[PDB]
Amino acid sequence: SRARVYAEVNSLRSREYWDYEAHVPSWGNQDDYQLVRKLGRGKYSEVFEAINITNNERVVVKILKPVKKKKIKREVKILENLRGGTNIIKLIDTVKDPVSKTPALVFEYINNTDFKQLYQILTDFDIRFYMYELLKALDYCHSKGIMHRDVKPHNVMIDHQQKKLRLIDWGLAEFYHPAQEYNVRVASRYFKGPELLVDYQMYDYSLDMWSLGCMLASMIFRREPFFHGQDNYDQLVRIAKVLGTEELYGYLKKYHIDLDPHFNDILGQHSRKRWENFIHSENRHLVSPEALDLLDKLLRYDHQQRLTAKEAMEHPYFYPVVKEQ
Ligand SMILES: OCCCn1nnc2c(Br)c(Br)c(Br)c(Br)c21
Numbered sequence: 001s002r003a004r005v006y007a008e009v010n011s012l013r014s015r016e017y018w019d020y021e022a023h024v025p026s027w028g029n030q031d032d033y034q035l036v037r038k039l040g041r042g043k044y045s046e047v048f049e050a051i052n053i054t055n056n057e058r059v060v061v062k063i064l065k066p067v068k069k070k071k072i073k074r075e076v077k078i079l080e081n082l083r084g085g086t087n088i089i090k091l092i093d094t095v096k097d098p099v100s101k102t103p104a105l106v107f108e109y110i111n112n113t114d115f116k117q118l119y120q121i122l123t124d125f126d127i128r129f130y131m132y133e134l135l136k137a138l139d140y141c142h143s144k145g146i147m148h149r150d151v152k153p154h155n156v157m158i159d160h161q162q163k164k165l166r167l168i169d170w171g172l173a174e175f176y177h178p179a180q181e182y183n184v185r186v187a188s189r190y191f192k193g194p195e196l197l198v199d200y201q202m203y204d205y206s207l208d209m210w211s212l213g214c215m216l217a218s219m220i221f222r223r224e225p226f227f228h229g230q231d232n233y234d235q236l237v238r239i240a241k242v243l244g245t246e247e248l249y250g251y252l253k254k255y256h257i258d259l260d261p262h263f264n265d266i267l268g269q270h271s272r273k274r275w276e277n278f279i280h281s282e283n284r285h286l287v288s289p290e291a292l293d294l295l296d297k298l299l300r301y302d303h304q305q306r307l308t309a310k311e312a313m314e315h316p317y318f319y320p321v322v323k324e325q
Pocket residue numbers: 039040047060062089107108109110111112157168169170
């Protein structure tokens with residue numbers, strides 16, 4: 001299996017570009033920054049609102065928890081490669097604790113409004129507008145030979161007042177190389193593509209497009225998350241109940257994918273559902289023929305038949321956004 005697009009991007013560039021293990025970051029001093037407030041925390045980091053003491057600017061400091069330095073080099077190099085990218089969070093600095101040498105990444109501040117509150121009040125145009133902005137970031141990183149691999153609402157910062165969007169947390173991102181087998185333990189359960197859920201390691205940029213399709217569905221239909229699995233097994237069941245079981249098996253046959261025998265107990269028999277089935281009185285104003293056509297071309301089992309970010313950007317759904325400029 002080969003990506004349709006940007007497939008040989010990294011092989012045509014200097015080894016230096018993608019060989020992140022040989023990257024040597026310049027680590028500044030964290031003394032330049034004053035921590036103000038904890039914003040969040042995960043497995044790999046804790047994130048703080050901070051002030052740059054010299055220019056008085058508000059920033060975000062991500063303090064990295066004990067992981068192998070390889071993964072830190074990967075994230076830092078990916079961010080350097082994506083610098084100036086449209087709607088990619090800007091890395092301002094890479095600094096270390098002056099006593100423990102704990103590394104930290106410093107990012108631009110975005111006045112984010114959490115998706116739970118935001119997604120309930122988005123208009124049809126808002127959804128089109130923000131999906132377009134997010135697609136700009138995905139086309140950009142894919143064009144730079146990079147898969148994000150953790151596209152989800154929590155990783156998309158939206159300033160709804162200034163209409164700014166940033167794709168954040170590149171800690172799971174990886175360089176795409178044709179025929180390389182990747183770890184399927186990436187992305188968050190609700191946004192994992194079928195390829196991950198059936199342990200298919202030869203995936204590519206199209207993984208991110210499945211995740212974006214999941215977001216689009218949650219926004220236009222107001223079921224968030226759209227596919228709400230209780231575990232990784234049930235996640236695929238939720239998907240197959242909509243996309244259909246025979247279509248799943250057709251996908252597995254095409255790529256010679258072996259299905260975990262535990263799926264025999266739980267997968268059942270389900271016909272493909274019409275997307276119009278998810279329309280009701282509270283989401284009618286967000287759904288259009290154009291929106292359903294785009295969604296149908298994103299949420300496909302066949303990772304090679306999903307729209308690329310660029311093809312999705314060119315879809316009629318986004319015409320009102322392009323006209324407004
Ligand atoms: O790149 C790692 C992302 C971690 N992360 N978590 N919460 C964040 C908020 Br709120 C803002 Br605002 C920004 Br800016 C970032 Br960054 C945040």
